[PDB]
Structure formats: structure tokens, C-alpha cells
């Protein structure tokens, strides 16, 4: 498949060079996966869509997505046009309230939810997780995205966006999870992306086109926009049997553009996500 005048991040993760304008991926496009948005909620309405979005949890007075922000991110997961993973199943867990604000203990119960509703839902290409959520240092945030992984879950986080050392946030310093930092259409390092050994990947972050609340669109920015490149390409690749949710972010970084990068700090992964499709 071929979508014509995609988004800048969705072309630039089917080539090995910056500047195209059409995303290049298998059909099959993470039908059979399925990815839990766990964030402010996903407007499952939104025609983007097309009935393989619902939420399944909320901690929070309604499931509704009031903020915008896991809707965006969920769009870039599996949206037809904005999405990675164009048919892959989107399970909503809001542990955001519609400022986008989270306490910790919710947003471990979120993760343990998930860890637990994967066994009851029909998933046969696998399970993905997707965390464009975080804060300062937390021991039990860091182990709580460790047990989810160890679970069977591809967990996904954002690496944050304070232009510092990942190992001082959570769950971006926990290193069994895969945290992704950010780069812009230009191929460099975003300029609020975190960096660190801990990274594992890069994704597009800088002005991201997606969906929005009240069956809108927007382009925004952040490490939040990158994760879910990834998560969706997890779920894509996961569909095509080339990896599994243990193995999936290591996979991934070895088969990522290297080097492409430029504002990269010595001891930072050069590594882009990238799919590697050939028609
Ligand atoms: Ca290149
Ligand atoms: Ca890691």
C-alpha cells in the first residue's frame, strides 16, 4: 500500500531518507493487534475511526475524551489517514483527566488494568501499549510499566519533553519498557525531546497531524506524538509475524535508520524508526 500526501511523520517511517510525502506499508496494516491507548481517552465516534476504536476504562466521572490529547494519540496509533497501524484494534484507558494531568497511583492502576484485560480480549497478532504520559523519577511508576511488559505487552512510552536525561523521569527511565524520543521532519532531535542512554528509538514528535475531539483535526508536538509511531508500528510488525511483544523494541532499534539524526548527545541511540517495507 501506498497513501499519496500522508503525514511528513507516516512517510518518513516507510524511507530511509527525509522529505518524502507517501507512507509505504503492508496491507495487512496491524489488522489482528491490538493497541491500548492509555491517556485521556479516545473519542471512539470519531469517523477516523471506523469502528475499531472503544474505550474499556476509565478513573475518571465519564469515559469521554474532553482534553483532545489521547484521541491525537490514538489517531496516530490507527487512524485510516493519520494512523500507523491503519487496521489495528484501539483499546482506550483514561488515566488523564481532561487537563491532561494524572496522578501516579491511577496511572499504575491503569497499567495493572491492562495487564489483566489483555486475557480477555481477542487479540491473535498480539498486544501493544502506548504511555505518551509521565513525570519525575517514581520506583513504583518504573516497575508497574516493567510488569506490564513482563506481562506480554509491548509497552510503549514517551521519553518526555524537557531537553534532559531521561533517567530522571517515569516511566522513561524504566529500561525493560521501549522509551522514544522525538525528531522532527528535518531529522533532527526535537527541540524539547529528552535524550539518554535509556532511549531506545526516535520517532516523529515535531507538528504531528492527527486526530481531535469533536471529530476534528490538529497538528501538535511532543515526545506523546512520537510513542504512538511507534506503538503502531509494533502493532504493524507484530501483524506480519516479524516480532512479538517481547522482542518488538529491540527488533525495531536494529532495524531502525541509523545515524540519520543530527543534535543527538554522545551516548544517545541514533536510531529512527523505520519499517522497512518493499513493495
Ligand atoms: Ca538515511
Ligand atoms: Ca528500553
Known amino acids: 500500500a501506498a497513501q499519496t500526501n500522508a503525514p511528513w511523520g507516516l512517510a518518513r517511517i516507510s524511507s530511509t531518507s527525509p522529505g518524502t510525502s507517501t507512507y509505504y506499508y503492508d496491507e495487512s496494516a496491524g489488522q489482528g493487534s491490538c493497541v491500548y491507548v492509555i491517556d485521556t481517552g ?19 466521572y465519564s469515559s469521554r475524551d474532553g482534553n483532545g490529547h489521547g484521541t491525537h494519540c490514538a489517531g496516530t496509533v490507527g487512524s485510516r489517514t493519520y494512523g500507523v497501524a491503519k487496521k489495528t484494534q484501539l483499546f482506550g484507558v483514561k488515566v488523564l483527566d481532561d487537563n491532561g494531568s494524572g496522578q501516579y497511583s491511577t496511572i ?40 506490564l511488559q513482563s506481562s506480554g505487552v509491548m509497552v510503549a512510552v514517551a521519553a518526555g519533553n524537557n531537553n534532559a ?3 530522571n523521569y517515569s516511566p522513561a527511565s524504566e529500561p525493560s519498557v521501549c522509551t522514544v524520543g522525538a525528531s522532527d521532519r528535518y531529522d533532527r532531535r526535537s527541540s ?7 532511549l531506545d528509538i526516535f520517532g516523529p514528535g515535531t507538528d504531528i497531524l492527527s486526530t ?12 506523546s506524538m512520537a510513542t504512538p509511531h511507534v506503538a503502531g508500528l509494533a502493532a504493524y510488525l507484530m501483524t506480519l509475524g516479524k516480532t512479538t511483544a517481547a522482542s518488538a523494541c529491540r527488533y525495531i532499534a536494529d532495524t531502525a535508520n541509523k545515524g540519520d539524526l543530527s543534535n543527538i548527545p554522545f551516548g544517545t541511540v541514533n536510531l529512527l524508526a523505520y519499517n522497512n517495507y518493499q513493495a
Open 42 to 60: 479516545i473519542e471512539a465516534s470519531h469517523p477516523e475511526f471506523e469502528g475499531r476504536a472503544q474505550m474499556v476504562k476509565t478513573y475518571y
Open 192 to 198: 524539547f525531546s529528552n535524550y539518554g542512554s535509556v
Open 108 to 147: 499504575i492502576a491503569g497499567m495493572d488494568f491492562v495487564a489483566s484485560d489483555k486475557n480477555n480480549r481477542n487479540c491473535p497478532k498480539g498486544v501493544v501499549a502506548s504511555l505518551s504520559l509521565g513525570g519525575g523519577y517514581s520506583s513504583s511508576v518504573n516497575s508497574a510499566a516493567a510488569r
Open 212 to 223: 481531535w475531539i469533536g471529530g476534528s483535526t490538529r497538528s501538535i508536538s511532543g515526545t
Open 165 to 167: 536525561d531521561a533517567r
